[PDB]
Amino acid sequence: SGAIYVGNYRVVNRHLATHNDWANLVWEDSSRDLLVSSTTAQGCDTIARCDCQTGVYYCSSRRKHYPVSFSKPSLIFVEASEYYPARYQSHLMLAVGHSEPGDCGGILRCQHGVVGIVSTGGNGLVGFADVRDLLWLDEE
Numbered sequence: 372s373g374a375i376y377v378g379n380y381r382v383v384n385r386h387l388a389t390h391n392d393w394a395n396l397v398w399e400d401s402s403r404d405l406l407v408s409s410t411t412a413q414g415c416d417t418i419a420r421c422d423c424q425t426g427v428y429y430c431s432s433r434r435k436h437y438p439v440s441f442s443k444p445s446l447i448f449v450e451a452s453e454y455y456p457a458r459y460q461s462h463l464m465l466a467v468g469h470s471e472p473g474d475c476g477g478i479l480r481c482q483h484g485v486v487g488i489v490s491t492g493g494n495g496l497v498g499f500a501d502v503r504d505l506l507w508l509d510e511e
């Protein structure tokens with residue numbers, strides 16, 4: 372589990388969005404496994420605006436923050452999960468590291484702020500759904 376709270380937006384894995392997230396939908400993209408919903412309260416998080424390829428992610432299945440190198444956001448074939456059939460996932464960054472399904476929502480951070488959230492993995496990889504291209508999360 373996990374979310375990003377920036378301005379009056381909540382950014383979650385689409386596959387973990389709640390009833391309230393759908394009722395209060397701002398934007399979602401199945402191919403990215405992202406959903407953004409509106410919030411009452413102001414969030415404290417900053418979104419990175421950068422092309423960093425190094426950062427730190429939170430892995431709930433290890434209770435550990437791991438420094439990683441990751442690929443630039445790309446279109447990657449992802450095997451079937453509980454939530455999606457086997458398909459190409461877009462805006463996805465890969466790193467060598469530990470990931471289990473319930474690690475989804477773990478934040479990946481760089482010096483500039485939030486880079487993305489855990490969305491995929493296994494096989495000794497972790498995949499993050501990038502948010503840095505979503506410039507509108509910084510306004511309105």
Ligand SMILES: CC(=O)Nc1cccc2cc[nH]c12
Nearest residue numbers: 421422423424425426481482
């Ligand atoms: C932009 C980018 O990928 N830079 C990068 C690479 C490796 C380490 C660090 C520490 C800060 N930035 C780092």
Ligand SMILES: CC(=O)Nc1cccc2cc[nH]c12
Nearest residue numbers: 452470471472490491492493
């Ligand atoms: C959607 C989903 O289940 N994502 C996910 C994240 C991290 C690791 C794994 C291993 C299978 N699936 C994973």
Ligand SMILES: [Zn+2]
Nearest residue numbers: 421423481483
């Ligand atoms: Zn950065």
